[PDB]
């Protein structure tokens, strides 16, 4: 997250931190995700496409820090890694993935002060352009940074119309109706590398809702180059069927 503010998991308790174990034993951060039911985390396909083996991954819930334990956190193996069959690839189409989570003890997520689910939107129901939404992740704080922040961050961006995002000087044909663009009016805050898979959350008629999933963008916090998010309200049947797997 470029700009914005440091936060803790109490302020985004559906946030899932996803890591990959390497040959040799080392573990690295991959992407964010969102807990949508006790056994299911939703994320982005692009995070996993090069290493689609479920055994490689570790998922944490209730975690506020990248490389240290947070009191009350839970650790999970990935029981099933489901990628969207129509994925294509910088402007990724159908960039959505599901992770079924199971602990070494064979259990799913147990809700607590630091672990909660996020509601899915109603079908084809999105907030109007100009609406403020929040994004959360452990991604870079500056485009030129080598390291990820150690502490979770969040910021606020505003929804951009498909009409505006389709302009040549924005993204042109790269952005489809199954995607949502969001940015800061001064381009001063944005998601960045390592924020992929994480939640874009808007209040849709009073309730917090998973509007989008961090997917792609050209650079970070650059003029005329918004963040692009998978439009969750356009994938409800896909989510519905695959969460029975």
């Amino acid at each position: 997250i470029i700009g914005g503010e440091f936060t803790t998991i109490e302020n985004q308790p559906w946030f899932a931190a996803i890591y990959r174990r390497h040959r040799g034993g080392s573990v690295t951060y991959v992407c964010g995700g969102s807990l949508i039911s006790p056994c299911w985390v939703i994320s982005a396909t692009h995070c996993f496409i090069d290493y689609p083996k479920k055994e490689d991954y570790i998922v944490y819930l209730g975690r506020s820090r990248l490389n240290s334990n947070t009191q009350g956190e839970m650790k999970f193996e990935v029981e099933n890694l489901i990628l969207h069959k129509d994925y294509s690839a910088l402007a990724h189409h159908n960039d959505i993935a599901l992770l079924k989570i199971r602990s070494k003890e064979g259990r799913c997520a147990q809700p607590s002060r630091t672990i909660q689910t996020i509601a899915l939107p109603s079908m084809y129901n999105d907030p109007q352009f100009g609406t403020s939404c929040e994004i959360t992740g452990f991604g870079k704080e500056q485009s030129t940074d080598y390291l990820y922040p150690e502490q979770l961050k969040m910021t606020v961006v505003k929804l951009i119309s498909h009409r505006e995002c389709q302009q040549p000087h924005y993204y042109g044909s790269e952005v489809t109706t199954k995607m949502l663009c969001a940015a800061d009016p001064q381009w001063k805050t944005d998601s960045c590398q390592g924020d992929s898979g994480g939640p874009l959350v808007c209040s849709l008629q009073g309730r917090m809702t998973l509007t989008g999933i961090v997917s792609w963008g050209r650079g970070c916090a650059l003029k005329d180059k918004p963040g692009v998010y998978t439009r969750v309200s356009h994938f409800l049947p896909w989510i519905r069927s695959h969460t029975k797997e």
Binding site: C31, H46, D50, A91, H92, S143, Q193
Partner: peptide, 14 residues
């Protein structure tokens, strides 16, 4: 480069 952008995390070429 592209390997430093959203969309290319956990990629073989990066």
């Amino acid at each position: 480069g592209a390997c430093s952008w959203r969309g290319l995390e956990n990629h073989a070429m990066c």
